[PDB]
Symmetry: D2
Subunit: 257 residues, 4 copies
Amino acid sequence: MYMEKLRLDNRVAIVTGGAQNIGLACVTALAEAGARVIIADLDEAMATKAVEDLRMEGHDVSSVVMDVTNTESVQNAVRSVHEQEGRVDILVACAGICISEVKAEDMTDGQWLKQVDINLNGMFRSCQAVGRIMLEQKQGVIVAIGSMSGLIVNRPQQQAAYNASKAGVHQYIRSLAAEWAPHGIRANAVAPTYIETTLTRFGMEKPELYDAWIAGTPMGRVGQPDEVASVVQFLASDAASLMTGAIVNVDAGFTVW
Amino acid sequence: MYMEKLRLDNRVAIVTGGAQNIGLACVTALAEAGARVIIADLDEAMATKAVEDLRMEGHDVSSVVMDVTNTESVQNAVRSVHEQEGRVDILVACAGICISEVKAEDMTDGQWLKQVDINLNGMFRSCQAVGRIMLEQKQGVIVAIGSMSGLIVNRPQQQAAYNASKAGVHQYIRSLAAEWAPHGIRANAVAPTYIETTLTRFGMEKPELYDAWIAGTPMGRVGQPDEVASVVQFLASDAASLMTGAIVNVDAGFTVW
Amino acid sequence: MYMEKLRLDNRVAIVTGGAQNIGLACVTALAEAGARVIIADLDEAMATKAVEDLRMEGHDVSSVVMDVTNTESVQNAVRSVHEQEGRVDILVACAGICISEVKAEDMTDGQWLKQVDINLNGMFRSCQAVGRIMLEQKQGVIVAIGSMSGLIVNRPQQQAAYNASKAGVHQYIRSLAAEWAPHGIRANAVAPTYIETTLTRFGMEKPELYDAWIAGTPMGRVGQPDEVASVVQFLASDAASLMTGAIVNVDAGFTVW
Amino acid sequence: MYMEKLRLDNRVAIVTGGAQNIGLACVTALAEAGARVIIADLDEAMATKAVEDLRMEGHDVSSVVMDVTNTESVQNAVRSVHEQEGRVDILVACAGICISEVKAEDMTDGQWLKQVDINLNGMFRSCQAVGRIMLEQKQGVIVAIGSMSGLIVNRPQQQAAYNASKAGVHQYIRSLAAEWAPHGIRANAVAPTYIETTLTRFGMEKPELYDAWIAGTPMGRVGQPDEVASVVQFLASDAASLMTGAIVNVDAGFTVW
Ligand SMILES: [Mg+2]
Ligand SMILES: [Mg+2]
């Protein structure tokens, strides 16, 4: 019973931002659990390459181009997955950016709007498009990649738009959880600490940043993408049947202090 | 000494959305505490009427036209206040809208983006413009009107964009609190329950909505604008000297259950 | 109207732990707002000196001996105040201790139990005894001194029993808020950061502790007792009429990071 | 890789309150993941029955008498497991009681103190005794059974001591997470909604209670023990390697409204 609940055999999953980093780890975890996974990403090349690596390991993985700033792109990408796969059982929404080391008094409208558009408006576009399909199935699960930045404020790097966008993502996901609970849908978010990715490594290589991050973390380390993916895979599975609207802290204790 | 900490004599306060409802109650409380208050609102006629009423009560109140969806408008209005008054000591940010009874699957891009733009992007525009002056002064206080909707999901009315945008406001304010703490600035938010205003008439006059609201509230009532204004005035005052980044629940116990 | 809401003229307030530090600041603030205040404290000589000092300033104050580890003591002290003054309008519950720099693997039963008994069990004894009178009145307000330690875990000093006891206090107060809301009673807590007091001054003179506390605080300072007393006085007043079950953060931004 | 992270083969787990209901479900989940499990419970005959049933399925399960109000009992039971098994890898702390429908103004000292003693003091006793072994090992994981009652206040049933005790449990576990993170130990809690058990059956058959619980739940149902056990098993596993100090909501959306 209990180990079987963790399986995702034959379930169709779309992972936005799935071509690299946390997204790619989530793709890999879902695929290992038996899911049919579609990488939805802005980079057509990256996605196609990732698909090859994963098929190489025997995974049922495909790709579609998606731009989360563009409603038409998102809806076209979701429709074509629905077309080819017949169903969408799982959405993992990882698409996001972080514009950091930009003081609140300095940030431009363009920086503000871009940050909110990708992280928060993109979450709306993604979840709405997939949600409509899940509603007709009366079955589905969404996992969003939130951030501890939605709950606490990072130091010393300034990024108020990021922090606000992720708090928005958390409460948006909770709203969906409430609205869609009677219709067989669950929606949760993970809120990770710093994860070593191609992008955060620039922060990691700057001692003023990295030393503060480590000093502020009880476990004394950043996380790795597979550690976020394991939680995401769990939340996507029937093992998590009683969980909806949860902001799950995956942060090495950062928010405890 | 304790009672004198509550006074705001000669302090310059800008209240966005100050022409009616919670905004106007905040303007009144600030003025009664001794502040020189500027109503910053979209509706010039409504603002001018409010100014006339308050001036007849012996208060020092004026108004300025401000559209929080427009950066130029916000920057010009804030500069005008600074030029005419000499300082900006306090910002109370009330400007906001709520598009409700719109299901998450049905909400248009237009509805989502308008709510995020006024509630959240408007908060950035207003706090940055005022914040720059406060940073120069190495002194200032911001109070945002957040919402219990930033932490819990209202029922039965669907309003996922509102809920997300207000969670965004809370965490934005907290980011400003952290960034600006060393510079003599405090920033807090109030998170109220339902308040009787023109904007909640549609719910209060609809039994399916109102009865649910009351049943969900330990005090068994909605709040009045003056009850929010009292907390806002407190948070704007030196009595709240140790409070920054606080999301202050003003909700008749609604979030307790 | 707004400034009048802050007054407590002729209201009867009991302050447990009121003889020094945060308790005494709360006593002072309440007295300055017009309340008749009873210091309820274990140390008779200390309470008596405090009463005599405040009386010299024109305040209406008195004291009663109360041991919050002892139910008979608490009940007798509260009954005595009720008979002597005719009513109990306000309870501010400050009595507490902090056993710190004791690792979780080392803490004895005696150390654990004493901390829980004073901080949490003593909160139940105090609140029940006053609460019964407030229920008869259909009117009352409780303010507990909680702690940021109920929400986050202090560093580097170990004090898991204190942290647990204060989280217990916060949720106990919220429980009372919910149960007693229909009967004209409000109950809230403050959650302060480090406050300079006779007790914490030892930690403040220990760089390993003090430097960590300052480094973790956005305002870069500890608080002063009067800054907590201001928030407590506000929460005890009709100005806070819409607030019940609130855990009000008074922490110089400590919990924001 | 991802599926192997969920395995607990040959790891030693003690489950307090493990003979029935949630505890028994946790025992079963751990055993199905390959753990060596010891039921630690108040009554010997009840635990023995469970052992016999699980051994019939080929599981490696045993039991020990443990009374969590009694330090000697707890220390002796933990020592017995250590001497028989050579290590303790996992503690799931489920021992607890709920005295409910007792108004705050009515609750006796005996009722308050017993609830705090079993739920909170017993958590300290259990966690210290096991924690000492885990510190020697520089390896261990604790999962406490908290409650949504630590975060929100149940209705209509009055149970302030239970609510307080569980908030205490949450913050005690977070304190252990912070203190023991550098030493290879993780500590998290689950915060469930109503779970159908032999004890909650009586409430579920009282319409005044059950109808309110259902109406308060987005999923419109209570949970089953296996749904809590699945989350506990995940948290105990290396798949949860990045999670410590998390209060994980498993509440069918109850705390979202
Ligand atoms: Mg922190
Ligand atoms: Mg609720």
